[PDB]
Amino acid sequence: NAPEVTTAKLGFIALTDAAPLIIAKEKGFYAKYGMPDVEVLKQASWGTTRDNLVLGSASGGIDGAHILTPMPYLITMGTVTDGKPTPMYILARLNVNGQGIQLGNNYKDLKVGTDAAPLKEAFAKVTDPKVAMTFPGGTHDMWIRYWLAAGGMEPGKDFSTIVVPPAQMVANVKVNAMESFCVGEPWPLQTVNQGVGYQALTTGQLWKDHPEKAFGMRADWVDQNPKAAKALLMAVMEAQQWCDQAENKEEMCQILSKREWFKVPFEDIIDRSKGIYNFGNGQETFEDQEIMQKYWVDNASYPYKSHDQWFLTENIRWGYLPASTDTKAIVDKVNREDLWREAAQALEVPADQIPSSPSRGIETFFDGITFDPENPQAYLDSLKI
Residue type, 121: E
Give me the torsion for CA of 293, 295, 297, 303, rounded to 10°: 110
Asked if 94 and 232 touch (Cβ cutoff 8 Å), the reply is no
Nearest to 131 by CA among 95, 107, 96, 97: 107
Backbone dihedral region for residue 78 (phi beyond 0: left; psi -120 to 50: alpha; all else: beta) = left
Q: How was this structure determined?
A: X-ray
Asked if 297 and 40 touch (Cβ cutoff 8 Å), the reply is no
Asked if 170 and 265 touch (Cβ cutoff 8 Å), the reply is no
How many residues are there in the chain? 385
Q: What is the DSSP letter of 201?
A: E
Q: Which structural domains are found in the chain, ordered by start? A: 1-96+206-366 (3.40.190.10), 97-205+367-385 (3.40.190.10)
CA gap 217, 9 in Å, rounded: 10
* Binding annotation for nitrate: 46, 99, 140, 184, 213
Helical segments of 187-273, H only: 187-194, 219-224, 226-244, 249-257
Per DSSP, the residues of 136-196 read TTSHHHHHHHHHHHHTT--BTTTBEEEE--GGGHHHHHHTTS-SEEEEETTHHHHHHHHTS
CA gap 198, 193 in Å, rounded: 9
DSSP strands (E only) in the chain: 9-12, 39-42, 64-68, 88-93, 99-103, 130-133, 160-163, 180-184, 198-202, 213-218, 276-277, 286-287, 363-364, 370-371
Nearby residues of 156 by Cβ (< 8 Å), 6 or more positions away: none
> Could you give phi then psi for residue 224, rounded to 5 degrees?
-80, -35
Asked if 37 and 10 touch (Cβ cutoff 8 Å), the reply is no
CA gap 239, 224 in Å, rounded: 24
Nearby residues of 284 by Cβ (< 8 Å), 6 or more positions away: none
* Binding annotation: 46, 99, 140, 184, 213
CA gap 347, 345 in Å, rounded: 5
CA gap 240, 213 in Å, rounded: 13
Asked if 6 and 63 touch (Cβ cutoff 8 Å), the reply is no
Task: Find residue 181's DSSP bridge partners.
Answer: 102, 132
